[PDB]
Amino acid sequence: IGSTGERGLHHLIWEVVDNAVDEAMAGFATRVDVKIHADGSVEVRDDGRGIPVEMHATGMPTIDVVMTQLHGVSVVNALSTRLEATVLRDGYEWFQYYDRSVPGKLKQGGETKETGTTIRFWADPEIFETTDYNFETVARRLQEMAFLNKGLTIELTDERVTSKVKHRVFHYPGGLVDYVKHINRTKTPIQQSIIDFDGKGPGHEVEIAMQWNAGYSESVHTFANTINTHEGGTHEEGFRAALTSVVNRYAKDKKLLKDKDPNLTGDDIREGLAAVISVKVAEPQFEGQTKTKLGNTEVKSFVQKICNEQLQHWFEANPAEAKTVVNKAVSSAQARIAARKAREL
């Protein structure tokens, strides 16, 4: 669903673009092109493998079963006066169309060794209050996708003048590292390094980038399979527990925190932290009707395990930066304990 306002209109775009990004995550697509045409249609192109073309079990070509029956682009077809798919697959160009979701006959074009998919849809103005997509919204979401898919270039062209175009290219070879650099642009890093590491488990993967600034706020951004887990979840709780343990162990080992002193809290250690956590989950589980919270039990211990290993390594290897970061958290911990003692008296 979505809604039938700006949130829902834009979800049409996210549904088509997600299918392209799935090809990227699988290591097959390198390029996604998005156009907002003057007619109010949206076109999305990828150099993926193409939507499957061959005859399904249903008694119709596999692309048709992808575009009509729900549980996907089906939602988009259903809320569009027209959809058009051009597919490069199995050594041929193919074209298929839908008028209010009713398929035409899949047509075979000429030969090609190229593989990919192009989807063009016209949002139904009788369903949506406004069909007037927001360039700035679309650009901000595609930029975010580019940060999360290193090997991916995403091009945006808006051809609507309210003939000049609005054009953007989003390519971030550094991935999460570039994301952290972006977060910390208007702040003052207190370490030259950006911390970057990853782990691979069965049915899950994690990548983390982090860098501390001189500020007093936490800017930690969390993703499960590319989606922004705004309400957080088990990947963020995994990460939080491992960071609190590593910094307390290290502060005690290097005597930057007395034997007899209380542990540093997460509030103390994550003051000035810019970080991104991107997990992949073969079988994801979401909590709240928001659906923006990851509930997968085994992701907590997976993320915690990986962060423990890689942060221990990094703190061990980088004593001067580690001291700066631990001292910042120690001075924070002393102000928080003094503030609380004075409020409770």
Binding site: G215, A335, R343
Partner: protein
């Protein structure tokens, strides 16, 4: 105005001083006394004023950007009007303070005392007021959209004419004992 940078002041008594129009960047004031002090038209980027007293001081027409006010006391401080961008007020005392029409959007106000505080027309969007004390607090016509508050906030603060979001309206009803069915 000579910019103070990357200095710590610890247990320093400033009551004897005019500090009007001073500019700090990454300056840490720990347990310093600013009672009765003129700090007006001053400018702070990434500075920390922790467990400091601002009892009867003036900070009006000042700018604090990404600063910590953790544990500081503002009793009878002349505050408004003022600019705070992404400041941390955790465990600060703002009881009885005149914060009318002050913008504290995206500020951490965790476990702050706002007992008897005047926040009429205050802009508090996406602020964190969890664990804060709001007994007798005046929030009439405040902008609270996206603000994180404890359920008791809705039965304690004076919020006549306040702006809230759908999620907050559901919490307002639950806090008054209504059983809301999403279905």
């Amino acid at each position: 105005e000579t910019v103070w940078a990357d200095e710590e002041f610890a247990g320093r008594d400033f009551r004897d001083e005019d500090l009007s129009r001073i500019r700090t960047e990454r300056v840490v004031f720990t347990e310093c006394d600013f009672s009765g002090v003129d700090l007006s038209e001053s400018e702070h980027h990434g500075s920390a004023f922790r467990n400091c007293t601002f009892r009867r001081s003036t900070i009006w027409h000042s700018t604090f950007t990404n600063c910590s006010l953790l544990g500081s006391v503002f009793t009878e401080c002349r505050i408004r009007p003022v600019t705070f961008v992404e400041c941390d007020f955790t465990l600060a005392v703002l009881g009885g303070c005149d914060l009318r029409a002050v913008d504290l959007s995206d500020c951490r106000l965790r476990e702050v005392s706002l007992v008897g505080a005047d926040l009429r027309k205050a802009v508090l969007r996406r602020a964190d007021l969890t664990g804060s004390r709001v007994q007798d607090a005046r929030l009439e016509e405040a902008d609270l959209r996206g603000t994180r508050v404890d359920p008791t906030f809705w039965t304690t603060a004076k919020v006549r004419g306040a702006k809230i979001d759908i999620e907050q309206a559901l919490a307002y009803a639950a806090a008054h004992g209504l059983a809301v069915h999403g279905g």
